[PDB]
Amino acid sequence: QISVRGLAGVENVTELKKNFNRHLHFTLVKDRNVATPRDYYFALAHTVRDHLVGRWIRTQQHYYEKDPKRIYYLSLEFYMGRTLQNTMVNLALENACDEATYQLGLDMEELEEIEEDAGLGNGGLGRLAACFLDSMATLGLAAYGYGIRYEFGIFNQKICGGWQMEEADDWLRYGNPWEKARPEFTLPVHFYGRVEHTSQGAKWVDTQVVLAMPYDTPVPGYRNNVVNTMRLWSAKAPNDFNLGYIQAVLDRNLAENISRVLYPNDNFFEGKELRLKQEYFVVAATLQDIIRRFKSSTNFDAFPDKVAIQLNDTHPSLAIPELMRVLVDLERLDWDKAWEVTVKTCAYTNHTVLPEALERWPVHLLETLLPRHLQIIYEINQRFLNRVAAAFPGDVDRLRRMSLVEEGAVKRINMAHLCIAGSHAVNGVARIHSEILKKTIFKDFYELEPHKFQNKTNGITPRRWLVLCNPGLAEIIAERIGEEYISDLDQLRKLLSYVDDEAFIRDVAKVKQENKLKFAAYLEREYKVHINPNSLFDVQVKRIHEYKRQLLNCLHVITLYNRIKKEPNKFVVPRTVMIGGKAAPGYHMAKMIIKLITAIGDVVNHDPVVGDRLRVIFLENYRVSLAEKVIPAADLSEQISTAGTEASGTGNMKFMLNGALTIGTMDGANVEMAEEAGEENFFIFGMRVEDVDRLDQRGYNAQEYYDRIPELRQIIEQLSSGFFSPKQPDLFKDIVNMLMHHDRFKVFADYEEYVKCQERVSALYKNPREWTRMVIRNIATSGKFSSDRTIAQYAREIWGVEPSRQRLPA
Amino acid sequence: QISVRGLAGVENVTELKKNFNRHLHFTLVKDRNVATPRDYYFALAHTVRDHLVGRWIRTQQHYYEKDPKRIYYLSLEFYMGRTLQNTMVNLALENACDEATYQLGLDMEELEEIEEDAGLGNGGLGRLAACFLDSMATLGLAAYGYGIRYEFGIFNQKICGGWQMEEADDWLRYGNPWEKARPEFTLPVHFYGRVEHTSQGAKWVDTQVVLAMPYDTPVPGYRNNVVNTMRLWSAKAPNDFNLGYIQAVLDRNLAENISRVLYPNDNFFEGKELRLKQEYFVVAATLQDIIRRFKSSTNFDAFPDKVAIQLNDTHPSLAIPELMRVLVDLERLDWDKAWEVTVKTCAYTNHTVLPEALERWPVHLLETLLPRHLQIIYEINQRFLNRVAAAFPGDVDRLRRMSLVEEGAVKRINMAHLCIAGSHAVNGVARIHSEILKKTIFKDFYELEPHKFQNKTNGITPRRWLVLCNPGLAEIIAERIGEEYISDLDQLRKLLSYVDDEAFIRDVAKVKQENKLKFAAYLEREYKVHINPNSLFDVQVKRIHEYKRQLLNCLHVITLYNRIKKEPNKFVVPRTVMIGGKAAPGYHMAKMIIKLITAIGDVVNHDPVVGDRLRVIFLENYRVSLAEKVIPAADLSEQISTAGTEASGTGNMKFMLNGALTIGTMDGANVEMAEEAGEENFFIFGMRVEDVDRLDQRGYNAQEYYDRIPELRQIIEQLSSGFFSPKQPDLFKDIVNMLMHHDRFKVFADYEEYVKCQERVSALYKNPREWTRMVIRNIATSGKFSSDRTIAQYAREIWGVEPSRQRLPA
Numbered sequence A, B: 001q002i003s004v005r006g007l008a009g010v011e012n013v014t015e016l017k018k019n020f021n022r023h024l025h026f027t028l029v030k031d032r033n034v035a036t037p038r039d040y041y042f043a044l045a046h047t048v049r050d051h052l053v054g055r056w057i058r059t060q061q062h063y064y065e066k067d068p069k070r071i072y073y074l075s076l077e078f079y080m081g082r083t084l085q086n087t088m089v090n091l092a093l094e095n096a097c098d099e100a101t102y103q104l105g106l107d108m109e110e111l112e113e114i115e116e117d118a119g120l121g122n123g124g125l126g127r128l129a130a131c132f133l134d135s136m137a138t139l140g141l142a143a144y145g146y147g148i149r150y151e152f153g154i155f156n157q158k159i160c161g162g163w164q165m166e167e168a169d170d171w172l173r174y175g176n177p178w179e180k181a182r183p184e185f186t187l188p189v190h191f192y193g194r195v196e197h198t199s200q201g202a203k204w205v206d207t208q209v210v211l212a213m214p215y216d217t218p219v220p221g222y223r224n225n226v227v228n229t230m231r232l233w234s235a236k237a238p239n240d241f242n243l244g245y246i247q248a249v250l251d252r253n254l255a256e257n258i259s260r261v262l263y264p265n266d267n268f269f270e271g272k273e274l275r276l277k278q279e280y281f282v283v284a285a286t287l288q289d290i291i292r293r294f295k296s297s298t299n300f301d302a303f304p305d306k307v308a309i310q311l312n313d314t315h316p317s318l319a320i321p322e323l324m325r326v327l328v329d330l331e332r333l334d335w336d337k338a339w340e341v342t343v344k345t346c347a348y349t350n351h352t353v354l355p356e357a358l359e360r361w362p363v364h365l366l367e368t369l370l371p372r373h374l375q376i377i378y379e380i381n382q383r384f385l386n387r388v389a390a391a392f393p394g395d396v397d398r399l400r401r402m403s404l405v406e407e408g409a410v411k412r413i414n415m416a417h418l419c420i421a422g423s424h425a426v427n428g429v430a431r432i433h434s435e436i437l438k439k440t441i442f443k444d445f446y447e448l449e450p451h452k453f454q455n456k457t458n459g460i461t462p463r464r465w466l467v468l469c470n471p472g473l474a475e476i477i478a479e480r481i482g483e484e485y486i487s488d489l490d491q492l493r494k495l496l497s498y499v500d501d502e503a504f505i506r507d508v509a510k511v512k513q514e515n516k517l518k519f520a521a522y523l524e525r526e527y528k529v530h531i532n533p534n535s536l537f538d539v540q541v542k543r544i545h546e547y548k549r550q551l552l553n554c555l556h557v558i559t560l561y562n563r564i565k566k567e568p569n570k571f572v573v574p575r576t577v578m579i580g581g582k583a584a585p586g587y588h589m590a591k592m593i594i595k596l597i598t599a600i601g602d603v604v605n606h607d608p609v610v611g612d613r614l615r616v617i618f619l620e621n622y623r624v625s626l627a628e629k630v631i632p633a634a635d636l637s638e639q640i641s642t643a644g645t646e647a648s649g650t651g652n653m654k655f656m657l658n659g660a661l662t663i664g665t666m667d668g669a670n671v672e673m674a675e676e677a678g679e680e681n682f683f684i685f686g687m688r689v690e691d692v693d694r695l696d697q698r699g700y701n702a703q704e705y706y707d708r709i710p711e712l713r714q715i716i717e718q719l720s721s722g723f724f725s726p727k728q729p730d731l732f733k734d735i736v737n738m739l740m741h742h743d744r745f746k747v748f749a750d751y752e753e754y755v756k757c758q759e760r761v762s763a764l765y766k767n768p769r770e771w772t773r774m775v776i777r778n779i780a781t782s783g784k785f786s787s788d789r790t791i792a793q794y795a796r797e798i799w800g801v802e803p804s805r806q807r808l809p810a
């Protein structure tokens, strides 16, 4: 049908059909008379996976022969989403599979919808790891994702009575056809025990063994015939475990609980033992694998020439003492050599400055669980603080601030401090975030080792986030500038010469309208809800967090509603306001905000005076596959974090790429997006970082805004008095109370400038041609925000490897 | 190579090789340079399974079109063993696969050894269920095995210091290529809750839901192109289960524990809730499936014309109140109609009379777990006891004896009583066992409903137990009488006309010698132990139990040893005495007997005066795949249960079929074996049933035997004084104490007649030609003990269906 989906050759289509029928018969043991849509999805999944395996085997054997430097991306989260369409895109099979499935009388799009998201992440951090794997494969890097195969990923969100209910994400129930179990590469992981000191060094003894069983998932590069590996570990009890008889067998679940469930906190640290077990499990099994692969080539001087280990936040920080422990206690290297090897191998990416997200592990926990690691950590701290003392003689304060060990009621290890000490490179994830690291939380580390601190601004893969989710926009771009932009997104800048082309203006607007029609009809089918597709689609989709200020959005929505009710017969640009996201199950305030959003929806959407001028929709179960649907349908992207809280963001990039204008603060990558497009093509409002600091110096008094802004006092009186909760008048007293007395994120301070900037958005929406021209200037400057640019910067400036766009032979 | 393994056509072999390479590449994602023997086993397993699927699909669709009466074999145990060789035998692929694997440079026998036993049973009962599935498929019956897919089967047995250690049988670690998950046919099972009484009948409410997910394994018939189904249920939590968040997800293991582990008791009842949960789980999920299939054809009058449900012992006795509950509470049939349907549908096989094996469930357990089932059971009991009162007016004693409810400190349900009340047929498993049921434990039920009581003497499948494990014996038989005997074992009687044929006598002895050489070399390789292959192979392999009198065997072994030491320079027929079996982990005395066997081995095998005249070997981890090796190598089969304890036995049949002579008691099927072969071709010794009763009347005094038999007093003094345990002199005081004061199985009473009969065995072994002629008369009369005869009798006399040997089209 469309050019960027590849050729449907007669031979290719004939072959896909006979393999689809072979898998349905032999793999699924179904015939055509009893097969369900789900069996059809499986037969197609098996058919497309068959095209991966030759390339996977050739790629892994090429890396054995070339012995390039190998990149290990260690993350507790890989937010992969669906694999089927992505595989078809990257192997140029999409039209051939559309054709083949069409001639068997099936609709490929209907089968695509049966695939479970692999939801092994919370949000931006896990999804960054998935975008990175795609870019590393597309850039021909010998790269491995290493993580945990959680039996349960991020919970499924149900709304009952406007409240979040959590259900277990049983994503493996029907099987995962993408993964290959490798039980033959099972490795032991040790816990507990105690340290004995001999003549022949320290020895970790009387440990409990958990086995780490790897599952390999292929990661195909974009049309380069490269297939990298994502290896995820599963926990298995050894067979002598607990070994009256029956209970011993049932108690195997204590060990296997390690890989059972993803912790569902975004930008929050929960100091639980099970979480620390998960962190060691993936680090211990991964490093044995890395070292095994290295020794198939005594001499650890070469190790950092052959290994880069990237730590995705501090979650795998124990890779640093674990590498030391293997090198010192098992390989018998002297400390200083092992340390040199460790620092040149490891690099650390920081994702946030929010103090409640920073991992600070109680010493009593590390003492019990990892007694040797705590010895190595104390030793790292002693030698590190000796270099601080020598560089800043007499600065005792610097010594306590920089210590890996925090003093207090409970002693803690500051894992971020451990990462900076043990890494040759530390980066933030947007330029403003990286500047904030050098000025504030890591200022001391920066003054000691300035050379370690880098920026690597985040990106998104334009394969998933343009070609796959928005084929119609991919195509009209490809009509004019060709296909090369998909693996070289800077080529989108060639679209600036089409900003006054009438046909291109009409095509961009038509694609947006088609996406909106198709998304409106998805709402209607799956969640029986009736929305005007000619309205401005105002969408805020991201995890529910106080710093991301869904509440600021709520205040704008109630403001529009109060203005309509005061002047019902006046024209307003119609809007569909869609807010979506999950709250961490223990995050009371996030749970209240969801409830407020639905309570606003219950009043606004049933007021007959309002008409279809204003709709408020809570998008249930926001996840990667819902992002692929709603982001192409959006007109306005809400990126409204308080300045200095959103380290980067990546949602923001997805929407820029997909033809939405952005209303946001000068926060995170919003700053670089506005610089790329021009400030005049962006709806910037609110305090800058500097302004928030000025407010903190003198003190944030919310009362001042309530006393001065009659529109805002109206909203607060409505919330307080039960306008939005008539059955429970006081339902929202926690929200009011927090906004008036304990708002760390200064929602009222940005309210006036937000509402005014939202009026400018409405004004430009009235002029479709100028709105669309501004959209073109956004899409055209979105190239910087490709994860291909990000990974090329990681490779050249951190890993010391050269990306390549050259095809392997097929 | 050999004729009964089928043709190796050029096309067949070429095709097997290209499919073996396709599976290694696409299924296993290996190349030839990194594949292990285990990958080769998997590629071959996938290649042979491909030949099953066409036949499986055609067979299941033929049963939909013909709508024959359907047989449901409900068992908690299916002792399947390995599937690969059995599949090749039944599809006539063995030589083609030998050839194909040979030309890829691989040894098929080496790959066969990599397969895990499916050890989902304890012993004779589970294995009977596996032999039955094979016979039902070979006889073209529309039959389904229904059970539980235990994550852990019977434990792996290790011997340390001559003691049994148990290890978890992690048989699914590498995957099971034979099973197909059918998550789409997942059914709810209810537990706990309470009964509400409405106008509209009784209602079971506030239950906990566990999901039952079926896994289907194919059961191929012998060369008839029939493939039946074994459906095993797995327990899954529902996704709202427990639904702070983390613990709720971890607590899903409470529900999934139901299908985690097989209870490892043979002929013993353990009244644990988890066991009752397993029993309901398989009954509830199975009956919903049976009823679903029935309704795809309102009218339950026809149900027993379309459904037979066979209960394998009382383990699935709850099928009776469950069928009543579905018919009365859900389908709204009146009681008497539902009851008529239930009785005509259900039939009960009893496997033992040992009182400690009989399931007697405390009422408090059924009250909590299955409150509605207990109501239906009380109602069954009331109506049943009303028919007893009317037939035997005034016999109040008969009323308490026959009650389904036993009075006492704890009230219990007698599940066997429930089975007789609710079944149209009750059978024992050998003629003497069935007679004992009518004379003793079920005498009262027999006098009420004599027509219900049948015999169905056990059998074994000659596919696994001759063709597969003993190809050389299959072949020399096939040389002379053809191949038809494999599906018609009575044809073996044609071998009586070869009893004086010299060439046949030489071939039978040569096959036995080859089996012994090959088994001796297996001992040497896998367990570094050196045994004389010219010795008489005296083997007792079966679960370790007091009633099976491994201890009697121990006494014979110590007797031979004491005779050698008294007269070292006298000729004795050399023997290798091999005893093997598992003890239930909580069965203290069974654990002591294993230890005594190894302690005897430690003294006998290291005495230089003994030479290689007497060896005692404990065969570790006796299981189905070890039975296939040792049973073809045996000369003497030890079947030495106290008369009236071994209901049938099936080991006995395996050895008769495979060219061993039997030393045994007139117990179980030994009686019918001796009648088929002639008493003069059997080594019968010891008390008959009548003699044991006479001894019980007057009282069993073991002291009398100790006082009168100086050879036996010597043994007991050696045991007592630490001859066999010098480091712990009193190690065996429990054994001595039990033999002298509390022997329920009268070991001393059979000692004299056992030792004398063992002298007759030795005498005939000195005359190889007459030993071999006696072997021929045994093999030649073993036809009755085919499970094809057993199943044909079940089908004609219980299920009301006609077996068929006609091929389905391929």
Ligand SMILES: OC[C@H]1O[C@@H](n2nnc(-c3ccccc3)n2)[C@H](O)[C@@H](O)[C@@H]1O
Binding pocket: A122, A124, A125, A128, A265, A266, A267, A268, A269, A313, A351, A352, A357, A429, A458, A645, A646, A647, A648, A649, A650, A668
């Ligand atoms: O770089 C990827 C994104 O990372 C997010 N991010 N920080 N900590 C985390 C986090 C911390 C603990 C547990 C789970 C997740 N997740 C930042 O909030 C966002 O601004 C970035 O765009």
Ligand SMILES: OC[C@H]1O[C@@H](n2nnc(-c3ccccc3)n2)[C@H](O)[C@@H](O)[C@@H]1O
Binding pocket: B122, B124, B125, B128, B265, B266, B267, B268, B269, B313, B351, B352, B357, B429, B458, B645, B646, B647, B648, B649, B650, B668
């Ligand atoms: O019919 C199959 C065989 O059944 C055995 N058999 N009885 N109860 C049992 C049993 C009882 C409870 C739990 C597990 C197993 N197992 C008999 O001991 C044997 O004589 C027969 O040959």
Ligand SMILES: *Cc1c(COP(=O)(O)O)cnc(C)c1O
Binding pocket: A122, A123, A124, A127, A541, A542, A543, A622, A623, A624, A625, A627, A648, A649, A650, A651, A652, A654
């Ligand atoms: C991209 C993405 C995110 C991150 O969005 P932010 O607005 O940067 O918080 C979260 N969830 C999903 C499903 C995503 O696709």
Ligand SMILES: *Cc1c(COP(=O)(O)O)cnc(C)c1O
Binding pocket: B122, B123, B124, B127, B541, B542, B543, B622, B623, B624, B625, B627, B648, B649, B650, B651, B652, B654
């Ligand atoms: C046949 C068989 C049994 C039953 O043997 P008996 O001597 O009848 O107790 C037990 N275990 C295995 C592995 C078998 O093959």
